[PDB]
Structure 1
Amino acid sequence: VAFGSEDIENTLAKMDDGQLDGLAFGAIQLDGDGNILQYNAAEGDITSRDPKQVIGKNFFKDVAPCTDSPEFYGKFKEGVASGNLNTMFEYTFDYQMTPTKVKVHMKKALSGDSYWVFVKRV
C-alpha cells in the first residue's frame, strides 16, 4: 500500500479512523463538491495544517485555493462526472504556507460518491 498503488482505493475502503494516519503519504477524502470529509496526519505535516480544523471546509475554496484551476479542480470535476477519477500530476502548494512542490494522485473512492486526493513531497 503506497502512493500510486494500482488498487489504493480498495485498501483505504477497508481502513478505520486512525489507520489513515499511519500512511506515509498525505490523504484527503472529499465529497463531490470538494468538501473535506477526511484528512490524515501526513497531509497536516506537509501543509502545516491541523487535521481537525480543515474537516468540513471546502478544499478548493477555503483550504487549497491554489488548486482551483483547470488542471486540478478542473480535472476533479471531470472525474466526478464520469465516475472514473484517477489522475497524477505535480503541483505547487502555496496558500498560507511556504511554496512546496508535490506529486498529486486523485482517485475515486469505491462508493463512487467520495474522492481521494493523495500527496507526497518531490
Structure 2
Amino acid sequence: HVAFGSEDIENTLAKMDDGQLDGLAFGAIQLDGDGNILQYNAAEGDITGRDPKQVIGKNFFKDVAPCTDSPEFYGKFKEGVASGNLNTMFEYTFDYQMTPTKVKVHMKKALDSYWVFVKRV
C-alpha cells in the first residue's frame, strides 16, 4: 500500500512496474521535463476517461490536459523542473472533455522525470 502524499512516495513508486502502478489508490502520471507522458496509470484513467495506452507519448500540457496550462499548474511544474526539487501540492478542476471534476494534485520529481499524482476531492 502507498498513500497519496506520502513523504517518500517517489521511493516506493520507483520500485514499481505497470501492474503495481495500475493498482495505486490515486492517479499517477509520469512526465518528462518537456511534459510528455511517460506513464499513466489505470486510476488516473478512472478519473479522467482517458485510455492510458493512448495518451503515452502525448504532451500533457499542450494536448491532453489543456486546462492545466496555467501559472497554477504548468507554471509550478516548470518552476520545479528548473529549480531541481519538484514537490508541490494544490487543488484544481479538470474540465476538458470530461464532467468538471475537483481534484487535488501533488507533483514530485521522480527518484529526470516528474510525477503528477491526482485524487478526487
Q: TM-score, normalised by structure 1?
A: 0.97
Instruction: Return the offset for 1:18.
Output: 1.5
Within 2, Cα distance between the matches of 1:52 and 1:16?
15
Post-superposition Cα deviations, 1:19-73, rounded to whole Å, max 9, x if no partner, equal 1001010000000000000000000010011100010110000100100000100
Within 2, Cα distance between the matches of 1:101 and 1:61?
20
Tell me, what secondary structure is at the counterpart of 1:18?
helix
Tell me, what secondary structure is at the counterpart of 1:2?
coil
Instruction: Return the offset for 1:95.
Output: 0.7
Instruction: Return the offset for 1:17.
Output: 2.1
Tell me, what secondary structure is at the counterpart of 1:96?
coil
How many residue pairs get aligned? The number is 120
Q: Which runs of 5+ in 2 are unaligned?
A: none
Q: TM-score, normalised by structure 2?
A: 0.98
Which structure 1 residue ranges, 4+ long, deviate > 6 Å from structure 2? Answer: none
Tell me, what secondary structure is at the counterpart of 2:43?
helix
Q: Which runs of 5+ in 1 are unaligned?
A: none
Within 2, Cα distance between the matches of 1:46 and 1:16?
21
The RMSD of aligned alpha carbons is 0.5
Tell me, what secondary structure is at the counterpart of 2:77?
helix
Post-superposition Cα deviations, 1:76-99, rounded to whole Å, max 9, x if no partner, equal 001000111000000000011110
Within 2, Cα distance between the matches of 1:16 and 1:52?
15
Within 2, Cα distance between the matches of 1:87 and 1:115?
11
Instruction: Return the offset for 1:16.
Output: 1.1
Identity %: 99
